[PDB]
Every structure is written in structure tokens, then in C-alpha cells.
Design a protein that fits this description.
It is classed as membrane protein. Keywords: mitochondria, ATP synthase, membrane protein. The entry is titled "Cryo-EM structure of Euglena gracilis mitochondrial ATP synthase, OSCP/F1/c-ring, rotational state 3". Chain A is oligomycin sensitivity conferring protein (OSCP). Organism of A: Euglena gracilis. This is part of a larger assembly, with chains A (about 140 residues), B (about 110 residues) and C (about 50 residues). Chain A is about 50% helix and about 0% strand. Chain A has about 140 residues and is an all-alpha fold. The radius of gyration of chain A is 17 Å and the shape is globular. In chain A, about 25% of the residues are buried. With about 110 residues, chain B is mainly β. Chain B has one domain. Helix content of chain B is about 0%, strand content about 40%. Chain B has a 6-stranded antiparallel barrel with strand order 1-2-5-4-3-6. The two termini of chain B are about 25 Å apart. Chain C is mainly alpha-helical and about 50 residues long. The chains are: A mainly alpha (about 140), B mainly beta (about 110), C mainly alpha (about 50). Chains A and C meet through helix 1 and helix 4 of A and loops of C.
């Protein structure tokens, strides 16, 4: 199933290439750099595709529980909506057992996104409900 | 007054804590103080002992260790450790952070 | 003259066993540190899986 573009990129080196940012981390930097390299090269800088996969996966886990690392990510009824490159990288993480380090991947792909697009975000956690006076005062 | 965060705690071993940083652009100096938000009310001070290549901060804890949990946020003061100093300290015992202890300006 | 010979022989055995003990404590500590790191040795493993 996995497309040869991902196999060629994978067996080739990617970390030494030019990126928007020198990323700090151990092994988990590669899983995000490879997502960024697919989004930049083959999908033509459609970064939010993989950002949706995380938003997809956050619900998929609620449909299966935390015992989703066991499952081969290619063959599955629930993973059908996922991107092939994202599936390949979840499979690589399944092989290496780094799947417990997931959120450190999305947090880094978000950095590369926010720097390539140059979109620094600023989260807000205000009140038990929002309001109009403070939405314009804050 | 706005504080500045760098990341959250990765794990702890008793008095020790390791840090997972966010926004990898940001750095921290070597022997600075770090303020951990165990809760919105209480705050624990700590010192940075060492740093790593992956991006992490080995930290030694100095107060309210038992309240620490994983997933808590960290903030940085941007200065070395320092205590209140002067002639207004002769009659009272203190904690090495300056916290006067009960019993039955300048920094340094 | 005999007590002194016995004394220096004991001073040598004491000061030698003190060194062997210090070295032994180092071997035990480094053995535990080397075993932890060797077992905890982490690698990328960028190899095919499919």
C-alpha cells in the first residue's frame, strides 16, 4: 500500500535538509519533519491536511480507547479517512514504539506551520462562558 | 504583570524534575530560578541544574514538591537565585529562599 | 625494631586495602551506570516496516 514517494523520502535523509526552523527534540523531531516534508513536496504546502488528521485522531481514539497503537494503521475501518503519508508515519512510530510521544509531534508540526506561514497563535481560556464586552476589551 | 513560560514538566524523581519545552525558539540561562504553577494560587520555586541537546531542563525543586504533578506549566524569572538582604535580618531565622519561619529593600 | 616492622606492614595493608575498596566502590557505581545506559540505549531505527 505505501506510495513509493514516501518510501524514497524515508530511506533517504531528510533531517539535514533546510527547514523553517532548527527543531529541538530527540527522535520525535523526525516524525514531524517528515510530515512537513511531505506537505511541502508532494502535497504542495497543504499543511492543514495533516493538522486535520490530528483533529481526526482526537475523536478516533474516543471510538477505540488507548489500545489503538496495536492496530495496523493501513488496514482499518475507522482510519479510512486518513492521509497515506500520515498513515505511513504512524506505522513507523508503531514500529519504533514512540507512539506514546505523539503530542510532541503535533506540537512541533504546529511550530513549523506557524513559522512557514508565519502565524503565531495565542490561546485563550476565558470564563465559564464568553461575552461581548470582554471579547472587544481583551 | 505578565509571566513568560517555556514549557511543562516531563517527569520528576523526588526532588528532581525534567522539562519538556514549548516554542523551541526560546532559551533559558544556566542557573536561573523557575516558578512552577502547581495551582493558580500556589507557586513552587526551582533552579536549573543542567541542559540537554534535545531541549530539556534538569531542575532541582525547593518547595512544595509533593504538590507537583506532570503536565504542569513552568515560568522563568530571568535571574539567578537571590534572597532578601540587609540589616533587617539579624533577629529572625529564615529559609535559604528568605521565607521567614514563625517561632514560639535589597536582594543579593 | 620488630614492632616497627609489624607496624609498617600493617600500614601498607591498611593503605592498600583502602585503595582497593575505593576502586571497588567506583566499579560498582560505574557498573550500575553503564548497565542502565546500555539497556536504556535509544536509537532512531529508520528502517522499513510495511
Amino acid at each position: 500500500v505505501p506510495s513509493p514517494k514516501y518510501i524514497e523520502i524515508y530511506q533517504s535523509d531528510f533531517s539535514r535538509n533546510a527547514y523553517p526552523l532548527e527543531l529541538l527534540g530527540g527522535s520525535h523531531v523526525d516524525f514531524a519533519k517528515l510530515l512537513y516534508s511531505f506537505a511541502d513536496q508532494v502535497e504542495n504546502k497543504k499543511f492543514e491536511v495533516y493538522v486535520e488528521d490530528f483533529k481526526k485522531l482526537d475523536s478516533i481514539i474516543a471510538e477505540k480507547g488507548p489500545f489503538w497503537a496495536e492496530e495496523k494503521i493501513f488496514q482499518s475501518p475507522t482510519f479510512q479517512g486518513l492521509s497515506e503519508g500520515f498513515k505511513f508515519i504512524l506505522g513507523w512510530i508503531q514500529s519504533e514504539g514512540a507512539i506514546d510521544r505523539l503530542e510532541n509531534v503535533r506540537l512541533a508540526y504546529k511550530e513549523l506551520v506557524n513559522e512557514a506561514r508565519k502565524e503565531t497563535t495565542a490561546t485563550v481560556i476565558v470564563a465559564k462562558e464568553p461575552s461581548g464586552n470582554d471579547l472587544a476589551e481583551i | 504583570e505578565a509571566k513568560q513560560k517555556i514549557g511543562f514538566v516531563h517527569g520528576i524523581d523526588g526532588t528532581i524534575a525534567t522539562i519538556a519545552p514549548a516554542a523551541s525558539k526560546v532559551t533559558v540561562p544556566y542557573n536561573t530560578v523557575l516558578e512552577i504553577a502547581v495551582s493558580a494560587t500556589n507557586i513552587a520555586n526551582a533552579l536549573v541544574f543542567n541542559l540537554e541537546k534535545d531541549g530539556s531542563i534538569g531542575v532541582i525543586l525547593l518547595d512544595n514538591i509533593s504538590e507537583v504533578r506532570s503536565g504542569q506549566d513552568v515560568y522563568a524569572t530571568g535571574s539567578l537565585l537571590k534572597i532578601p538582604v540587609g540589616f533587617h535580618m539579624l533577629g529572625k531565622i529564615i529559609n535559604p529562599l528568605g521565607k521567614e519561619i514563625p517561632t514560639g529593600t535589597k536582594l543579593g | 625494631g620488630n614492632i616497627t616492622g609489624l607496624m609498617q606492614l600493617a600500614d601498607y595493608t591498611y593503605n592498600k586495602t583502602r585503595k582497593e575498596l575505593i576502586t571497588a566502590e567506583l566499579l560498582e557505581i560505574i557498573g550500575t551506570m553503564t548497565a542502565m545506559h546500555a539497556g536504556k540505549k535509544v536509537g532512531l531505527k529508520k528502517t522499513e516496516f510495511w
